[PDB]
Design a protein around this ligand. Structure first.
Ligand SMILES: *[C@@H]1O[C@H](CO)[C@@H](O[C@@H]2O[C@H](CO)[C@@H](O[C@@H]3O[C@H](CO)[C@@H](O)[C@H](O)[C@@H]3O)[C@H](O)[C@H]2NC(C)=O)[C@H](O)[C@H]1NC(C)=O
Ligand SMILES: *[C@@H]1O[C@H](CO)[C@@H](O[C@@H]2O[C@H](CO)[C@@H](O)[C@H](O)[C@H]2NC(C)=O)[C@H](O)[C@H]1NC(C)=O
Ligand SMILES: *[C@@H]1O[C@H](CO)[C@@H](O[C@@H]2O[C@H](CO)[C@@H](O)[C@H](O)[C@H]2NC(C)=O)[C@H](O)[C@H]1NC(C)=O
Ligand SMILES: *[C@@H]1O[C@H](CO)[C@@H](O[C@@H]2O[C@H](CO)[C@@H](O)[C@H](O)[C@H]2NC(C)=O)[C@H](O)[C@H]1NC(C)=O
Ligand SMILES: *[C@@H]1O[C@H](CO)[C@@H](O[C@@H]2O[C@H](CO)[C@@H](O)[C@H](O)[C@H]2NC(C)=O)[C@H](O)[C@H]1NC(C)=O
Ligand SMILES: *[C@@H]1O[C@H](CO)[C@@H](O[C@@H]2O[C@H](CO)[C@@H](O)[C@H](O)[C@H]2NC(C)=O)[C@H](O)[C@H]1NC(C)=O
Ligand SMILES: *[C@@H]1O[C@H](CO)[C@@H](O)[C@H](O)[C@H]1NC(C)=O
Ligand SMILES: *[C@@H]1O[C@H](CO)[C@@H](O)[C@H](O)[C@H]1NC(C)=O
Ligand SMILES: *[C@@H]1O[C@H](CO)[C@@H](O)[C@H](O)[C@H]1NC(C)=O
Ligand SMILES: *[C@@H]1O[C@H](CO)[C@@H](O)[C@H](O)[C@H]1NC(C)=O
Ligand SMILES: *[C@@H]1O[C@H](CO)[C@@H](O)[C@H](O)[C@H]1NC(C)=O
Ligand SMILES: *[C@@H]1O[C@H](CO)[C@@H](O)[C@H](O)[C@H]1NC(C)=O
Lengths: 92, 418, 184
C-alpha cells in the first residue's frame, strides 16, 4: 500500500465491505513498515542479498525456501573492502 | 610558458526523472458505474498506456545503475593521513553530517527544491484522487552517497588501477607525478614544486563552495527536470474542466438530468476527449525520457573515462590539460569536479628546426631549440627549463642542405673530457 | 495490438462495418461510419508515433556499434572500459540476427606484491629520477621496475636522469648509481 501507515490500512481500503479473502491482506502478524508504504504478506529477514524483485526505496523481495515463502530484505551494494595506504609503500 | 596554474571546474548532468503511473478508469470515469461500463466498448487504450509508462519507469533505475554502480567493491575511506599536502576534507564524507554525505553535497542538496493518506483526508491530493501516482526510486539517496564515497576513496588511494582489476596502493605524490608525466611535463617539475601545487589545489577547492553558497541559478539543469514533470501532472488535472462539446464537463450533471439513450451521446464525447489528454501526456513523457537517457549515457562515459582514468580527449573533462576528477551526487543528477593544468606567464624566444655541427644535422629528442640571444638551449615545450645541447638530447640524420632554416652551433660530447 | 483494435466500436452501434450498412440507409449510416473512421485513424497514428520513437533508439545503438567497430576492431583504444574490462588488446566481430556481438580481449594484472618506494635517489649531490618505471626495495637493495609487471633491474645512468639537488624532493633516499662504462 503506497503511502499509508500500517495501522490505517483497514480504514483506507475500507476493510469491512471486502470479501474475507481480501481481508487477510489487511491484518497483522506480517505487517512491515517500509519507507514506500506498508507491506503485508512478506517475511522480513535481516540479511542482505542481491535484488530479485525490486519493491522500492531500497527494499527488494524474493521467494525463498526457508517451507517456501516470500521474504523482503534490504539490498546490498557490494562486498566491503579496504586498501592498505601508506606514504612509502606500493604494490606491483 | 614559465609557470602554471591548477584549476578546479564543475560540470552538472541530469541522470533520471520521476516515475509515474496512471489509473485509466479513475481518471476518465471516477467511480461511476454508468461510465466504466460505456468505457468497455472502447478499445484497449488503457493497457497500452501502462505498458509505455512502465517501460519509462523501469528505465530510470538502469540509468542510475549505469552511472553509479561502476565498481561493486565498497572501498572504505582511510583515516585521513597525509596525502602530500592535499586536503580532501570538503569532499570526503563526515561522520556527523546527515546521511554521511560530504560538505559539498550538503551545499548541493539545499539549492534544488524538490503526503501520507492520513493528511489528504492542495494540488497533490487533487491529483491523487484522480488516479495519478508518483512511484519512489529504487536506490535511495543514502545508497548513492555510499557509491560515490567509494569511487572517491579508491582513486585517492590506488589511482587508475582499480578500474581495471585489483586495487594497488601508491603514494599520492607518486601518482600526481605520473599524471603530470602524462600531459607532457616531467616529474622533477612536480617533485620540486610540491607545496605550491598543494596550496593551489587547496585554495581552488575552497572557491567552489563559495560559488555554490551565493548563486541561486547554480544547478539550473537539475531544476528544469523537476519543474516540467510537475507542470505535466498539473496540466493533466486542469484538463478535467473541459467539456469537449458536451453539455457540461461534470459527469454527475449529465447522469442526473438525462436518461441513458440521451446521456450516452455526451458521455461518449467526454470519454473521447479525456483519452486524448492521456495519450498526449504519454507521448510527451516518452519523448523526454529519450533525452534523459542520452544524458545518463554521457554521464556514464564521463565517469568511466575522467574519474577512473585520464583522458587525452580535448575539452572532454574540463578546460586545459586533464589531471583527475572527483564525483559528487546531486538530486536526480551528478556533479564532476575536474582538476586541470593551465600554462601561465610565458616568454618569447628565437627558434630553429635543426643544428648543423660539422656536416651533420641534430634534431631534438623531446623538446625544442631556443636562444636567449647569444646561447642555444633545449627545453621541453610545455615548461621553460633549459639545458645544454649534447648528444643525448639530439639525434643525427642527414646533412645540412635539405633543412631550410638550419643554424650553426656546437654540440658537447658528454664523455670527451674523460 | 493494431489488429485487436478492430473489435472496438468507438461509440458506434457496432464494430462490424457490414452490420451497419445492412440495417441503416446512407443518411442514418454516415453517423456511425464517421465514428468508426475517426476511431480507426487514431490507432494508426498512435502506431506510427511509437514506431518513430523506437527508431530513434535503434539509430543510437547503430551509431554506437559503428564507432565501436571503427575503434575497437580496426585499431586499439586507450579509452577506459570502452572495449571491455582491463587493458584492451584486440576485438573480433560476429554477426547476430538484428545485431552485432563483439569479443574483446583484455590484459588483466594478477598476483601482486608489496614493496617500499622512493621518489628519487640522492647519489652524491644530485637527484636521479627514473626514465620509465619506479624505484622499489626488497628490504636491503634498490631496483627499478616497470609499473605494470615486476621485472627488476639495476639503477644505472641509462635508467635515470639528473635534475637539481637533494633538498627540494621530500622523501629522497641515499643509494649508489652504477656507471656502465667506468669498468672499461
Ligand atoms: C609561479 O606563480 C606562483 C603563483 O601562482 C608564484 O607563487 C607566489 O610567490 C609569491 C612570491 O614568493 C608569493 O607572494 C608572497 O605573498 C605572501 C603573502 O601571501 C607574502 O608574505 C610574501 O612576502 C610574498 O609576497 C605568492 O603568494 C605565491 N603564490 C602562491 C599561491 O604560492 C610563484 O612564485 C611563481 N613562480 C615562478 C617561477 O615565477
Ligand atoms: C582542511 O581544510 C578544512 C577546511 O578549511 C580544515 O578544517 C578547518 O579549517 C578552518 C580554516 O582552515 C580552521 O579554522 C578549523 O580549525 C579547521 N578544523 C575544523 C574544526 O573543521 C582542515 O583542518 C584542513 N585540514 C588540515 C589537515 O589542515
Ligand atoms: C644567455 O644565457 C647564458 C647562460 O646562462 C649567459 O651566459 C652567462 O652570462 C653571465 C653574464 O654575467 C656569465 O656570468 C656566465 O658565466 C655566463 N654563462 C653561464 C655559465 O651562465 C648569457 O649571457 C645569456 N645571454 C643573455 C643575453 O642573457
Ligand atoms: C654554417 O657553416 C657552414 C659550413 O658548414 C658555412 O658554410 C660556408 O660558407 C662559406 C661562405 O660564407 C662558403 O665559402 C663555404 O663553402 C661554406 N661551407 C664550408 C665548407 O665551410 C655557413 O656559412 C655557416 N653559416 C653561418 C656562419 O651561420
Ligand atoms: C634483495 O635482492 C638482492 C639481489 O638479488 C639479494 O642479494 C643477494 O642475496 C643472496 C643471498 O643468498 C646472495 O647469494 C647474492 O649474492 C646476493 N646478490 C645477488 C647478486 O643476487 C638480497 O639478499 C635480497 N634481499 C632480501 C632480503 O631478499
Ligand atoms: C644522505 O646523504 C647525506 C649527504 O649527502 C647525509 O647528510 C649529512 O647528514 C649529516 C648528519 O647525519 C650532516 O652532518 C651532514 O652535514 C649532511 N651532509 C653531508 C655534507 O654529508 C644524510 O644523512 C644521508 N641520509 C641517510 C644516511 O639516509
Ligand atoms: C503512523 O506511523 C508513524 C511512523 O511512521 C507513527 O509515528 C504514527 O504514530 C502512526 N500513526 C498511528 C499509529 O496512528
Ligand atoms: C532483526 O533485527 C531486529 C532488531 O535487532 C530483531 O528485533 C529481529 O527479531 C531480527 N529478525 C531476525 C530475522 O532475526
Ligand atoms: C612577445 O613578442 C610580441 C611581439 O613582439 C609581444 O606583443 C609580446 O608582448 C611579447 N611577450 C609575450 C608574448 O609574453
Ligand atoms: C624567415 O623569414 C625571413 C623573411 O622572409 C627570411 O629572411 C628568413 O630567412 C626566414 N627564416 C627562416 C628560418 O625561414
Ligand atoms: C601488502 O600489505 C598489506 C598491509 O600490510 C596486506 O594487507 C597485504 O596482504 C599485503 N600483500 C598484498 C597486497 O599482496
Ligand atoms: C611517511 O610518513 C611518516 C609518518 O609521518 C614519516 O615519518 C616519514 O618521514 C614519511 N616518509 C616520506 C617519504 O614522506
Amino acid at each position: 500500500y503506497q503511502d499509508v501507515n500500517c495501522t490505517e490500512v483497514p480504514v483506507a481500503i475500507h476493510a469491512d465491505q471486502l470479501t474475507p479473502t481480501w481481508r487477510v491482506y489487511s491484518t497483522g502478524s506480517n505487517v512491515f513498515q517500509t519507507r514506500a508504504g506498508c507491506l503485508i504478506g512478506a517475511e522480513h529477514v535481516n540479511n542482505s542479498y542481491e535484488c530479485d524483485i525490486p519493491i522500492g526505496a531500497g527494499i527488494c523481495a524474493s521467494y525463498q525456501t526457508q517451507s517456501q515463502s516470500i521474504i523482503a530484505y534490504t539490498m546490498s551494494l557490494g562486498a566491503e573492502n579496504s586498501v592498505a595506504y601508506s606514504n612509502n609503500s606500493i604494490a606491483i | 610558458p614559465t609557470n602554471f596554474t591548477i584549476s578546479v571546474t564543475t560540470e552538472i548532468l541530469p541522470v533520471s526523472m520521476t516515475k509515474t503511473s496512471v489509473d485509466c478508469t479513475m481518471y476518465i470515469c471516477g467511480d461511476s458505474t454508468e461510465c466504466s461500463n460505456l468505457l468497455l466498448q472502447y478499445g484497449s487504450f488503457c493497457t497500452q498506456l501502462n505498458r509505455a509508462l512502465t517501460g519509462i519507469a523501469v528505465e530510470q533505475d538502469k540509468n542510475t545503475q549505469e552511472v553509479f554502480a561502476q565498481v561493486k567493491q565498497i572501498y572504505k575511506t582511510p583515516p585521513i593521513k597525509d596525502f602530500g599536502g592535499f586536503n580532501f576534507s570538503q569532499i570526503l564524507p563526515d561522520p556527523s553530517k546527515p546521511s554521511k554525505r560530504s560538505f559539498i553535497e550538503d551545499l548541493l542538496f539545499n539549492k534544488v527544491t524538490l503526503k501520507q493518506y492520513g493528511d489528504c483526508l492542495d494540488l497533490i491530493c487533487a491529483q491523487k484522487f484522480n488516479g495519478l501516482t508518483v512511484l519512489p526510486p529504487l536506490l535511495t539517496d543514502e545508497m548513492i552517497a555510499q557509491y560515490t564515497s567509494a569511487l572517491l576513496a579508491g582513486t585517492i588511494t590506488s589511482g587508475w588501477t582499480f578500474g581495471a582489476g585489483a586495487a594497488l596502493q601508491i603514494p599520492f605524490a607518486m601518482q600526481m607525478a605520473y599524471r603530470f608525466n602524462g600531459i607532457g611535463v616531467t616529474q622533477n617539475v612536480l617533485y620540486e614544486n610540491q607545496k605550491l601545487i598543494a596550496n593551489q589545489f587547496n585554495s581552488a577547492i575552497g572557491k567552489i563552495q563559495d560559488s555554490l553558497s551565493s548563486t541561486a541559478s547554480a544547478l539550473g539543469k537539475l531544476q528544469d527536470v523537476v519543474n516540467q514533470n510537475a507542470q505535466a501532472l498539473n496540466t493533466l488535472v486542469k484538463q478535467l474542466s473541459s467539456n469537449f462539446g458536451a453539455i457540461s464537463s461534470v459527469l454527475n450533471d449529465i447522469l442526473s438530468r438525462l436518461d441513458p439513450p440521451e446521456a450516452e451521446v455526451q458521455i461518449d464525447r467526454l470519454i473521447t476527449g479525456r483519452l486524448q489528454s492521456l495519450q498526449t501526456y504519454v507521448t510527451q513523457q516518452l519523448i523526454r525520457a529519450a533525452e534523459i537517457r542520452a544524458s545518463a549515457n554521457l554521464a556514464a562515459t564521463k565517469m568511466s573515462e575522467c574519474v577512473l582514468g585520464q583522458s587525452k580527449r580535448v575539452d572532454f573533462c574540463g578546460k586545459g590539460y586533464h589531471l583527475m576528477s572527483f564525483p559528487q551526487s546531486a538530486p536526480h543528477g551528478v556533479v564532476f569536479l575536474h582538476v586541470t593544468y593551465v600554462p601561465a606567464q610565458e616568454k618569447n624566444f628565437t627558434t630553429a628546426p635543426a643544428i648543423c655541427h660539422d656536416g651533420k644535422a641534430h634534431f631534438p629528442r623531446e623538446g625544442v631549440f631556443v636562444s636567449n640571444g647569444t646561447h642555444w638551449f633545449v627545453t621541453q615545450r610545455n615548461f621553460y627549463e633549459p639545458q645544454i645541447i649534447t648528444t643525448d638530447n639530439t639525434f643525427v640524420s642527414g646533412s645540412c642542405d635539405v633543412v631550410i632554416g638550419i643554424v650553426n652551433n656546437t654540440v658537447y660530447d658528454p664523455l670527451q673530457p674523460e
